[PDB]
Symmetry: C5
Subunit: 256 residues, 5 copies
Amino acid sequence: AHKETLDKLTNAAINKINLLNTSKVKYLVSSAFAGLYVGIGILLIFTIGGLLTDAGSPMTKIVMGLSFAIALSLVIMTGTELFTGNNMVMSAGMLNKGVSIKDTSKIWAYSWVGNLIGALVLGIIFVGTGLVDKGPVAEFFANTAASKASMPFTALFFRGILCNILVCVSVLCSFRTNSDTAKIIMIFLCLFAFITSGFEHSVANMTIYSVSLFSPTISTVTIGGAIYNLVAVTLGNIVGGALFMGLGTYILGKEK
Amino acid sequence: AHKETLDKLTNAAINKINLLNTSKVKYLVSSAFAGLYVGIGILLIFTIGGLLTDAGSPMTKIVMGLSFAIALSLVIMTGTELFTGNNMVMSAGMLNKGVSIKDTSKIWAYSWVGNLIGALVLGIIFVGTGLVDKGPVAEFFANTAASKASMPFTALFFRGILCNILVCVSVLCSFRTNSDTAKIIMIFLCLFAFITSGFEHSVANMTIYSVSLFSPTISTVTIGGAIYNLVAVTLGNIVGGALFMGLGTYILGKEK
Amino acid sequence: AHKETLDKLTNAAINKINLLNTSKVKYLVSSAFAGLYVGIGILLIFTIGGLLTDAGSPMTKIVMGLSFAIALSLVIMTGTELFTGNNMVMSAGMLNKGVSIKDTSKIWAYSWVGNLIGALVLGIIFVGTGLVDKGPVAEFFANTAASKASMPFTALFFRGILCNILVCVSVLCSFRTNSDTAKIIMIFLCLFAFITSGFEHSVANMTIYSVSLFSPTISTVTIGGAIYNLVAVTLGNIVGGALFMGLGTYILGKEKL
Amino acid sequence: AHKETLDKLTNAAINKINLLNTSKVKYLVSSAFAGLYVGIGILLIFTIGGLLTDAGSPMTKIVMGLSFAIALSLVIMTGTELFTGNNMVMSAGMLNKGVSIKDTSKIWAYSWVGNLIGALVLGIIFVGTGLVDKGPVAEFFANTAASKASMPFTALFFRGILCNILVCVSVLCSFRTNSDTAKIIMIFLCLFAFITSGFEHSVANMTIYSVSLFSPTISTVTIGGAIYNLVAVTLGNIVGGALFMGLGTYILGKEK
Amino acid sequence: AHKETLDKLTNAAINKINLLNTSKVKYLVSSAFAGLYVGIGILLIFTIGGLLTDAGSPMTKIVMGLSFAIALSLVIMTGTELFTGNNMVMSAGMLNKGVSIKDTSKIWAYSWVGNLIGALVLGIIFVGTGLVDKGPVAEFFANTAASKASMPFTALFFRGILCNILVCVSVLCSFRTNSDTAKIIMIFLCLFAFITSGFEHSVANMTIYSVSLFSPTISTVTIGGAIYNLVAVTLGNIVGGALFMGLGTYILGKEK
């Protein structure tokens, strides 16, 4: 069971360095589709957070957390590239040696730049809608945009650790079943979990900092506070995806 | 995986005009339906919005985007012609040289009109019920059908982009999975995102203005404003479905 | 896929009038199961409607719609004869030369009369439950039954279309997928819409003007006001079932050949 | 599709008496399993009424119906034997001569009794939990078991009919599809329907009264109403399965 | 239908011990997974209940039970080794001779401890985030670690029994169907039922007593209250799985 999976994970890992070594335009795009897809999820639950944080309701983080299913679901279904999964994958394929430590940091790089490109594009467009001009919407943006850049390191690190856990554990669950519906539910869950709980996702945080910097209605974080939050959380994501899930998957299904 | 998708996409475009070119009756009826189905979605959400606006609920815009999955789900299940969705289909199709740059417009036209024919035929029939005869139902249709015409062209554009990114990706999602349940789910999300977040949909607004103009009890906008909108937004809906969605599927899946 | 679907729609007309001929007991029964099944869901959403009207809640009309799904789902899953439905199937199956205007009108009658007999039986049985002796629910029933009589024939007619447009469209959907999960899900949305929006449904209104006439804890409507509501609604229903759904499906799927 | 369905039922019943004609120990520990599964619902949906009635939220009777779904679900997904199911099963079958009045009743009382062991077994255990010592949960048990016992036979009898119409019909639906998912979705709506509407279920009452009795903190029921209710309701559920759903399904697909 | 399921249940328990009689490092890393997953569940539903108790919303208990779905479905979807599951499985196999009384009480320990390991890990990494710095989260994590620990043995014995009754029947449901969707749905139901009703699942508490025993902000009772709770609850899970379900599932499938 775990072999057929660490098998699936290994092949897919390969099929990633192969497309990269084909066209960079291709790999670049698909990374900058996942970023934009995932970013869509921030817009929903932030248009949310405002309306419910504003009216005092205690349901905000709950309703928000639930309504972030559209994120990793657009990704997995469209078959696009997102770094947070490239972690657990590109790892066990480096452990199961389908791709090397070479090919791993080769990936995690471009996908991360790709993933950012997507956020930035959705930013421009999203900001260009006047939606984040006035109101308690860009207010929820700004504050949490600021909330997260002022947060100490080990949190953003350790919060980041638990995030890419669920994210991978879902991505894995995708590999483990053939019912797309079932994938979407497991995802729906694993994101309801991390979001409401209150964890951190780099490719996500990007769309947040993608909007709150093009903003003609505030900064409260600058670029410096963004770099920090990412590299903090990026760093966190990796231990979670690679050294827990990426590794443990490699073990559980190693033809030993 | 992306290759295959592209092919399927390409046929759908080929198989589109092909039909339009055999019959214009059969195709008009289809867009006619589609635009009405999408407008059934509007009646529902607006009968909600007035009922929740009247009671000042902090949720109203969250319950609405939840209650819109019916619109596009009815399209994809009855297998009918939706102008926005085509934007991806024909653009990726025309691109993949399966169909022409003149087969492309001849679809967009013939559907953007069909949908509206439906929007109309449905708009009339709604009025003849008279939930619009007065009260917060009739009201909501108004106060909102006004707000759209009196809005920057810079807004209606990017609003109308991000919407029809979520609309085609929902469609793209139906072109990649064989679960009719998962097809519906993703459609249910994508409209949760685009409607709750305040994006704009040409074929939907058609029913809005199909009803704020047939309703004896008042306008506040009149044709020009309705035209200033469908136009400012349909263009956006093309720029989203074509330049973003269709070009990317194309890039992500052509043999280099 | 529109041709293969008409084929199905057509093929479905055929073995229906074939069954009515085969025997009238077998057919009328099913018809009643349908009425009952649909009416069942009326008892649910009104109880909800009473529970929640009584507390002046805003989300009443909304929960009432989100809940009615069971009505048309039982129909489809049990595979049973529901008037509003045959409005689309039988028509487009005629147009597609499946059977005659004879069998069409002959089917529309029995279904409508069997749907009625389920509505009948359910009502008495339900009055027997004593769950409409007094309280906010027998109220909601009468409150609601009256409106549906005390309403202009023009709007009862029209509302009654869209409703059958939505019922039939969900039927149409039951024919274009092999996912019983998908069937129900689309029935869900379609009813959520038709109900919460404000549309009217002969077979389900059949179950409303059955409770409030059989309950001795009030007529505020009596038989006439029903005859009125039914008629206006049964027409509209027909005008959406056979004329928008029936026609369209045919025009989409008839081989010009 | 009717004749297949009928036949399925008919064979289903055969297997039943055959199992009963094989092992008594095997049949009566399946029975108890159902009743126990069923009773679990009653715990949850009274734990719900508890909280919900205690804060007078109008939605008490609504959330109960939505939550009682696990009952027949656990039974139907686990091939366990539920008395109320065999009312339609045993009868549809014996009407096709797949069995005899005798098997039917043997079943009907056997199944009924194991079922009664379930509720007996649960309640005891459930009493031992602390959850009925005090708190608004127990008031809800007492007050309910009470009314359930102190209500005109006529009534209870009719509430029986309606209930088992839904119970069996849902079971009917299980026999008519293969999407195990759907079997559930329907079970869901049928129980949402039957609880929230007011109808009485026999098996499920067992647990109710069982809990109330073996609760040291006040009964208001005594075994006095127990028998009364368990009879009046059961007598209804028999006309529910047998005379409606049972004989009705036979008349629907017999080679006549 | 029950034979396939006992045969399906036995092959299982052979592998579980045949995994340990092959590798410890294999088997435990999966059990540290199961535990963590279940924990992540507790990290969510307590995150809620902290917010929802901080505003007396009567709906606290219920919402929490609906959102707990993730733990056992994660454990299921990822094949990992969960203790409570085993209870029924083993004994169902040690009763139909595929493993021994040894292989049974052998499985039950390593996993029990494997599970505990992972629960301790997430714990620190959860404080590592500092979401138990203060707020009602750590508060709720405090009252409920202690309320559970300053509770009679017998109650928690009876409580825990009922739980693993459901937890195993949902696992048993896994075995009896090829729809992951359906599997996950039954877990969602079986979990919502055990938590909102009140019952006590040991491997979860492991995370609670892990979260709190590292929460810098307080112990409220200590280690002799954590051990007692775990002992009181674990043994209750075992009668419930081993004796109720296991013995039972066995009786149902056994071949005379």
